[PDB]
């Protein structure tokens, strides 16, 4: 049962290391989020290595998928924590960092934070299950590829198709109507992720001007991803073309 493997390989939740004694400036909050994103990225690698089928993909493709999907996996997991721990009332970044209205404003990402809150509110509406969540998170890892395709495109397509089949088998437990609600939710991630990345690329490019710090893991990923996304080399994969 590959879904039972997914449930068991879910990473431990990470602390932000948020310093509530320091002023709650945009520089301090965003730097904490970036430190958090770096720690989460290590967890994504550990998880992806043991993800059924991932090892079949060549190293270049594994790197491409992780770099293209990092914001998608991260934002989808933030929505899950917000839903599980607060019934989507707040943004649960970490046990030590839960955003209220104050923090949404202070972060200088108010509108993006409300966009994220809208996704977590969809989890409540649909009553998303952990089983559905874990399959969908794998689909997000496989949702953005290069415009000219991957090195082993057929191997990737076989893995993606297999996980789509798993999601269809799973919706029978809570069925065509549910399947399309879940694929609609997955497609909706691309637009929010595009806006999150646009802000991340901005603070990255004007880093010391805005005092926003980035850990080494994020510097490396963004340095590679930013020219590729901006030159139109990233190809978001949609279940239903808008």
């Amino acid at each position: 049962s590959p879904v039972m493997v997914l449930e068991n390989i879910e990473p431990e939740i990470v602390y932000a290391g948020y310093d509530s004694s320091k002023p709650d400036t945009a520089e301090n909050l965003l730097s904490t989020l970036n430190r958090l994103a770096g720690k989460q990225m290590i967890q994504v690698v550990k998880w992806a290595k043991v993800l059924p089928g991932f090892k079949n993909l060549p190293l270049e493709d594994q790197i491409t998928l992780i770099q293209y999907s990092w914001m998608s996996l991260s934002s989808f997991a933030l929505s899950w924590r917000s839903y599980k721990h607060t019934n989507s009332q707040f943004l649960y970044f970490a046990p030590d960092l839960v955003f209220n209205e104050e923090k949404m404003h202070q972060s200088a990402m108010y509108e993006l934070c409300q966009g994220m809150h809208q996704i977590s509110l969809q989890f409540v509406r649909l009553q998303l299950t952990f089983e559905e969540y874990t399959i969908m998170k794998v689909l997000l890892l496989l949702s953005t590829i290069p415009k000219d395709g991957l090195k082993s495109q057929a191997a990737f397509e076989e893995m993606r198709t297999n996980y789509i089949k798993e999601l269809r088998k799973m919706v029978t437990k809570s069925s065509w109507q549910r399947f399309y609600q879940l694929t609609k939710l997955l497609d909706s991630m691309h637009d929010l992720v595009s806006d999150l990345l646009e802000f991340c690329f901005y603070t990255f490019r004007e880093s010391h001007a805005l005092k926003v710090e980035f850990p080494a893991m994020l510097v490396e990923i963004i340095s590679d991803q930013l020219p590729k996304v901006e030159s139109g080399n990233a190809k978001p994969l949609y279940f239903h073309r808008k």
Binding site: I42, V45, K46, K49, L59, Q62, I63, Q67, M217, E220
Partner: peptide, 10 residues
């Protein structure tokens, strides 16, 4: 090797 390459190959 990049940090991502290092982590994926270890």
């Amino acid at each position: 090797k990049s940090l991502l390459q290092q982590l994926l190959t270890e």
